[PDB]
Structure formats: structure tokens, C-alpha cells
Amino acid sequence: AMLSYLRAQLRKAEKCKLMKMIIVGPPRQGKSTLLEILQTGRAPQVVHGEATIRTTKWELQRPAGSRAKVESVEFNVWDIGGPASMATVNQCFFTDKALYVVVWNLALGEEAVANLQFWLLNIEAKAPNAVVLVVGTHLDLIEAKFRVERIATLR
Ligand SMILES: Nc1nc2c(ncn2[C@@H]2O[C@H](COP(=O)(O)OP(=O)(O)O)[C@@H](O)[C@H]2O)c(=O)[nH]1
Numbered sequence: 281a282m283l284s285y286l287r288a289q290l291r292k293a294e295k296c297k298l299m300k301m302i303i304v305g306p307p308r309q310g311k312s313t314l315l316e317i318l319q320t321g322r323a324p325q326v327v328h329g330e331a332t333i334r335t336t337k338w339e340l341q342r343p344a345g346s347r348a349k350v351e352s353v354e355f356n357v358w359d360i361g362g363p364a365s366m367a368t369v370n371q372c373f374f375t376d377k378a379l380y381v382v383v384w385n386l387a388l389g390e391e392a393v394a395n396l397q398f399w400l401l402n403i404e405a406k407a408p409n410a411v412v413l414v415v416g417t418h419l420d421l422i423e424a425k426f427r428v429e430r431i432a433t434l435r
Pocket residue numbers: 306307308309310311312313314328361362417418419420421
């Protein structure tokens with residue numbers, strides 16, 4: 281560790297805050313809508329294409345109460361989808377030491393959740409040391425009055 285640290289100092293090492301973001305899920309779940317609203321904080325406005333892959337960049341400022349050591353973080357955002365025929369292909373794009381987010385529709389509920397195992401396994405097969413979040417969309421389609429006892433159950 282001492283030699284690695286001394287090499288970092290000697291080789292004028294800089295702090296890299298850029299990281300990999302991957303968006304995963306079955307077709308028609310709101311991956312692009314997810315990325316859009318998270319980037320902008322507004323209701324979606326963009327009509328997104330049919331391309332299997334969409335690439336962009338995203339900066340996040342630290343929220344109030346954050347104890348982080350960085351003012352902000354940056355993500356080189358990949359979003360892979362498209363026809364299921366290329367699913368076997370898309371498996372190659374998963375890597376380790378990257379952030380994953382799986383997108384699924386809450387309205388389908390358990391029907392979607394079962395399928396999640398497939399996608400989840402596909403990440404752990406090629407990303408043992410990666411953090412993957414899983415997010416349910418279409419929360420507006422869940423009745424607010426029942427919402428808690430629904431979402432917790434689904435969780
Ligand atoms: N009402 C509602 N619609 C959503 C929500 N999240 C995503 N969508 C829908 O998802 C669509 C975008 O899906 P998209 O990401 O292009 O599907 P993809 O083919 O899997 O990439 C939009 O037309 C939205 O109507 C949500 O929270 N509420």
C-alpha cells in the first residue's frame with residue numbers, strides 16, 4: 281500500500297470522480313424516462329429513439345447533509361436495450377466496479393419481479409464487486425392509499 285501511494289504521489293496522480301453507470305431492464309419500463317427525470321428533475325419531455333444503446337454524461341451535486349469527500353460525482357451513462365434478439369449480445373457490456381440500475385414497472389408487480397432475477401443474475405455473472413440498484417417505475421399507477429402496504433410487500 282505504501283508503494284502504491286508513493287507511486288500515486290510520484291506520478292502526479294489526480295482524483296478521478298468519473299464512474300460507469302449502466303441502465304438495465306426488460307423492454308418498455310422507463311429507462312430513458314428514469315435517466316431524463318433524474319438528470320433534469322422535471323417531468324419528461326424528450327422522445328427517445330429505438331437505438332439499442334444510448335450514451336450520455338451526468339453530473340450529480342452532493343445533497344444537503346452529505347458526508348461525501350467530493351463536491352460532485354460524474355457518470356458516463358450507458359443505457360442498453362432494444363430488441364430481445366440482441367440480449368445475448370448486450371450481456372458483453374456489463375463490467376465490474378461500475379454502478380448498475382435495473383428498471384421495472386411497479387404496475388406489473390410480481391410478474392416483473394420474477395423476471396428481475398434474470399437481469400440481476402446477468403450482472404452478478406460479470407460484476408461481482410458492483411453495486412446494482414433496482415427501481416420500480418409507474419408509482420403513479422399505484423394507489424396512494426394502499427401504496428405503503430403495496431410497495432413494502434413488493435420490496
Ligand atoms: N405514468 C408513468 N409513466 C412512466 C413512468 N416511468 C416510465 N413511464 C413511461 O415509460 C415510457 C418510456 O419508456 P422507455 O424507457 O422508452 O422504454 P424502453 O423501450 O424500455 O427504453 C414513457 O412513455 C412513460 O410514459 C412513471 O413513473 N409513470
